[PDB]
Amino acid sequence: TEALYQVGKEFTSKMDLEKPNYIVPDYMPVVYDKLPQPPSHREAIVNSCVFVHQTLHQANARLAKRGGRTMAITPRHYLDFINHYANLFHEKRSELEEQQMHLNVGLRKIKETVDQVEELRRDLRIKSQELEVKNAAANDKLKKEEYAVLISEAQAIKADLAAVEAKVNRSTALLKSLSAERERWEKTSETFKNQMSTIAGDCLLSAAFIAYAGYFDQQMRQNLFTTWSHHLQQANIQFRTDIARTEYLSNADERLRWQASSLPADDLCTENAIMLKRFNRYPLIIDPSGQATEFIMNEYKDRKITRTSFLDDAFRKNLESALRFGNPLLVQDVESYDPVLNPVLNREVRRTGGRVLITLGDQDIDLSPSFVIFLSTRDPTVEFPPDLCSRVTFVNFTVTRSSLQSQCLNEVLKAERPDVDEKRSDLLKLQGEFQLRLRQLEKSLLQALNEVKGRILDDDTIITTLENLKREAAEVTRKVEETDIVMQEVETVSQQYLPLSTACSSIYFTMESLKQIHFLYQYSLQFFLDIYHNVLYENPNLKGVTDHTQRLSIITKDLFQVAFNRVARGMLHQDHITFAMLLARIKLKGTVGEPTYDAEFQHFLRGNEIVLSAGSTPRIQGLTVEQAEAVVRLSCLPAFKDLIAKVQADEQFGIWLDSSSPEQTVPYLWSEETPATPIGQAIHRLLLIQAFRPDRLLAMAHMFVSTNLGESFMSIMEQPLDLTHIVGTEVKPNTPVLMCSVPGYDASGHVEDLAAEQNTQI
């Protein structure tokens, strides 16, 4: 902690972190034991910088204790952190001061313009007086050749007055047209002090996010930011809580180009793009889906980026060429990392004799300053050694629930409402261009007032340009309003397909969690997307259906069925009920008319955590000790509060307790106010069976799945595998077919027979 503080304080000396008005809180979140008792604002900032680094150690411990994969936290992360803090602070301070410079110039030109028309109106009145004097003098002289010149002079002044009065009206209309811009610039100028007062805190949070948050998923990234934000609050460090981190670390122009480079429209993906732009250590990209690899290649075509791999034979030549010519290089398969990059990643350059040299193996190479290297892997489960973790910036592309919901909502819209989906796509392109144009319009209009000398009225060209920029600004603003209402037509159509997209994300994230119960249950996002595509485009139940609502019900039903069919063929049969149980719970959440049953499922799981004392559990005649305890624990629900009495009042309960199939005749032994639902009755029977006949819990679970998903939902697993249909239609040629068998079983013969049936060579 002492080393971190000294590094932070020494490295932030160039920083302008002096806030004489800073108030020391009564409870100071001190992490450096020798931090001075009345800490200064700079002392608090460096103390907060130390705290952020130590939070990642706590963060790694929490994921490690839960079995999650963690990457080593090294001092190079801290050096990365403070480096980004210095750069962002200077960048944000420079941008704000530069912006405040234009606003002050723009405001003063408008104020001068208001003065100019005031004297020009005074001049207009003066010129009118001159016309009255000249006309009267000419008339009096005429009433008594030179007088023809005098009236010509008066007529010439009349043209001058006409030019003056037209200039007054046009400049007044310009001032009225510039009233909104003058008001907007005044408001921001007042807020200059507030923004200056939060840059120190805002950049600290932003820099920490770039240096540490890359490897973690959406939930863990948010937890880290909230922990840092909370600490700044206890330290009285000022930071704004309104602007999102993506908006504060990137502009709209860059985000527009990122979309053109096929970057997914997702906040975490946008955060990754910012990391891929503001990195200090070279980025290591983790993208199982592969859009990040495409995005990097789209973003760097103009700079001639080359894709290679650590396993390719030309990697050393490609690396040498990229270093020598300064071209971007993308290297895949970083799980096979070649330690030849160790000097490159550590930036161990030797500058002697006007030459910048990098030692690659035993050969010295001149390093061009435009060189950049990106490392990528498609395996999210790969472990890297701590030495590699210290040399790279982790940028993890993990699927978020919101992003998958958007992907699935868009895909069903494309399949089901192609006219609506196309209209949505055109509007997003139109609105993207429209917002782009407005940004140029406000920038250009600001530049015109910031580059004009003397007065605006003096040069009529400046006046015309402002009117044209204002005229185009109003029309585009008119075009934005009309695109807003048409999106409302798109949004209200898309609301019908929202529950399906929620079901899609829940199903995939259930599939993604199946690796926790067996190492074999590995499922990519493409596997689920193939399932989703099958339900939307290769569904025999939609052949003649035309009603959108009925098609949606078919799609929703068939999505659960195909998901179970394809996943369970690659699961052990003992785990089939577990996956079907979860799909039923996902489908239950989709039913608006059903209750949550959260308490009943809370009791169905865990359950044993309700500790019972010796006096808490009595001796119920007709039940064993374990059965009696299950009665007492189940008694905690309001529905089963009168559980012991109901069993005692039922002498026929003894017969049902020792029946072969008690799950099919579970007595109505639960109390309730309103009549329960068939799904609700099954859950009550499920709790009763678990309490009294745990050997029939699987049988009751199958009935629960039958109640939610149908009687034939699990029937495919009972049939022999139809390898012919799956290989011919469901399996892509690039996808290997994995024949996994338990000992004593071997699927080689099935493949050999399958080739014979198809009369194909193998």
Side-chain angles (χ1 to χ4, degrees), residues 231-290:
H231 185 270
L232 292 196
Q233 293 179 356
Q234 327 195 348
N236 285 23
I237 308 282
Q238 295 298 109
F239 65 97
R240 298 161 326 181
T241 61
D242 48 0
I243 183 172
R245 42 208 176 185
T246 56
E247 310 299 281
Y248 184 83
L249 291 176
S250 75
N251 50 73
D253 289 328
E254 195 168 21
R255 291 185 300 249
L256 196 65
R257 173 178 93 268
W258 286 344
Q259 263 169 31
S261 295
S262 69
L263 184 79
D266 178 47
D267 273 1
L268 188 151
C269 287
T270 304
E271 289 169 355
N272 290 2
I274 300 175
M275 294 174 188
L276 294 171
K277 173 219 185 185
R278 300 175 176 295
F279 63 90
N280 295 325
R281 290 176 298 177
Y282 289 113
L284 200 160
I285 298 166
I286 302 174
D287 191 14
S289 78

Side-chain angles (χ1 to χ4, degrees), residues 390-507:
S390 60
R391 298 177 218 241
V392 299
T393 296
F394 280 109
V395 180
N396 199 351
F397 282 77
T398 73
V399 173
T400 75
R401 286 172 172 286
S402 64
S403 61
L404 187 50
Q405 276 153 15
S406 296
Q407 286 175 232
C408 300
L409 173 69
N410 287 352
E411 182 65 26
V412 63
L413 211 71
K414 182 67 181 294
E416 286 295 288
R417 308 299 293 283
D419 67 307
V420 178
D421 198 65
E422 183 178 1
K423 162 187 292 298
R424 171 202 73 92
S425 160
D426 311 317
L427 284 182
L428 294 174
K429 182 174 72 68
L430 263 58
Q431 293 179 176
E433 298 143 353
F434 282 165
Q435 295 292 338
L436 172 72
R437 194 57 190 115
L438 283 197
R439 275 180 265 111
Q440 327 198 306
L441 282 163
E442 66 180 1
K443 166 175 298 184
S444 302
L445 188 153
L446 208 50
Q447 291 324 298
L449 275 74
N450 294 308
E451 293 293 327
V452 57
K453 314 301 295 176
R455 312 165 282 178
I456 296 179
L457 284 88
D458 289 318
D459 182 56
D460 291 3
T461 302
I462 288 297
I463 302 183
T464 55
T465 56
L466 295 192
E467 297 166 308
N468 300 3
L469 295 180
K470 281 295 307 187
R471 180 185 313 113
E472 202 187 35
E475 294 293 328
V476 176
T477 309
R478 185 220 63 178
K479 297 160 211 168
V480 175
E481 296 287 354
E482 69 187 359
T483 47
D484 284 358
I485 62 170
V486 181
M487 199 39 60
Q488 294 160 236
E489 182 65 26
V490 163
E491 182 66 26
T492 187
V493 174
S494 305
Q495 278 293 119
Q496 197 191 9
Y497 301 92
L498 183 63
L500 178 69
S501 64
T502 307
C504 281
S505 65
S506 312
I507 288 174

